[PDB]
């Protein structure tokens, strides 16, 4: 039937194997077939005829990619609920060489993780930087600022422009 | 003028970078109904001329194509086309070919 597959690096599969038995313990509650292909290093979210709706497989397919993007499986666990949707942004096509790509990588993170946690307190999302992705998960009116911050900061734009608009909109919130 | 088999060949020792002699020699060779000595001449003037002369080198591919325009073949003018497309520019020989066609 349905199947959505995602490949993983070496960093999360060992972290998956402590939770993939819990993933199959949790996917069985919605009757979804989860594969732990240790030979392939990939997981596939498959549908079953004992399930209610096929939409929860794709919501777990975002959770399986969140499980494969070195985000926590507890942090990927809330995606199966209604009012929490993820945003697995690929930011690979920004700079070819590793020099200027790593220049904007820490600038989207900041010194001691303050600026990466700043957008977490600005746009209300779980920002997860692992490898060449910037994954977020939250309300879409807050998550619209997440894709606006992630797509422009891999270019020559800094997060100081993003946070200052976010600090102004948060201050005029209570009115 | 150079009108013999020995005449235009002697000028090649004095004028190596001159394809204009082979441009008249290919008019002097294929006029005797044997263009195999004229197709040899455009092949010889490629390996005899200096590589720094681009005005005669691209014209050498334009000479063997315009000779191929009336007195050539179907795939022989195209095999000389993709040989000029590797040794020289693509569309500048094709804009020459658009004027030739």
């Amino acid at each position: 039937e349905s199947s959505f597959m995602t490949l993983f690096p070496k960093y999360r599969e060992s972290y998956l194997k402590t939770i993939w038995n819990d993933v199959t313990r949790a996917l069985d509650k919605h009757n979804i077939a989860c594969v732990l292909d240790l030979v392939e290093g990939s997981m596939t979210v498959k549908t079953t005829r004992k399930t209610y709706d096929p939409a929860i497989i794709l919501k777990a397919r975002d959770l399986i990619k969140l499980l494969a993007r070195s985000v926590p499986f507890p942090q990927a666990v809330k995606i199966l609920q209604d009012d929490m949707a993820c945003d697995v942004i690929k930011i690979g096509n920004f700079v070819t060489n590793k020099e200027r790509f790593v220049k904007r990588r820490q600038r989207l993170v900041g010194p001691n993780g303050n600026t990466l946690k700043a957008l977490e307190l600005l746009t209300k999302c779980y920002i997860l930087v692992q490898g060449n992705t910037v994954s977020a998960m939250g309300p879409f009116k807050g998550l619209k600022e997440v894709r606006r911050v992630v797509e422009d900061c891999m270019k020559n734009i800094h997060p100081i422009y993003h946070i200052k608009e976010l600090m102004i909109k948060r201050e005029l919130a209570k009115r | 003028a150079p009108e013999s088999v020995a005449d235009f060949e002697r000028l090649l020792i004095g004028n190596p970078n001159s394809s204009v002699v082979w441009m008249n020699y290919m008019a002097f060779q294929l006029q005797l109904s044997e263009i195999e000595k004229a197709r040899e001449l455009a092949e010889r003037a490629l390996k005899t001329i200096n590589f720094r002369e681009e005005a005669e080198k691209l014209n050498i591919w334009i000479a063997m194509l315009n000779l191929e325009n009336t007195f050539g073949t179907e795939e022989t003018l195209e095999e000389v086309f993709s040989r000029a497309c590797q040794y020289m520019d693509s569309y500048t020989i094709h804009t020459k070919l658009l004027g030739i066609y």
Partner: protein, 111 residues
């Protein structure tokens, strides 16, 4: 079982929810029920609750015509867009399943 089925294209994008379940061939969709038609504020087009209200009409027009099953070809934006599945997926596809319409060999077939 008799396989009274078509194909269901649900556009669960980031800005709206458009549902156009097609036939066994790609043309001649028997149903086309928008999410912004069942809620009139121009802001609830991406809401799944308006998409769940829209999904009752989506099951209705096929059950009126004769398609008792629908295989889901789910759609996010894809391509040169945000490429991720939005909010309108988990409610609109479930309400077709809550209406007894048989799901089987479902897919996400966006760009």
């Amino acid at each position: 079982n008799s396989q009274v089925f078509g194909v269901a294209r649900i556009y669960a994008s980031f800005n709206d929810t458009f549902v156009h379940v097609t036939d066994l061939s790609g043309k001649e969709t028997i149903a086309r029920v928008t999410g912004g038609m069942k809620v009139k504020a121009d802001r609830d087009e991406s809401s799944p609750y308006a998409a769940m209200l829209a999904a009752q009409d989506v099951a209705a027009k096929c059950k009126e015509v004769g398609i008792t099953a629908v295989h889901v070809k789910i759609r996010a934006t894809g391509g040169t867009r945000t490429k991720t599945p939005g909010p309108g997926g988990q409610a609109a596809l479930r309400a077709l399943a809550r209406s007894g319409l048989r799901i089987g060999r479902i897919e996400d077939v966006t760009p």
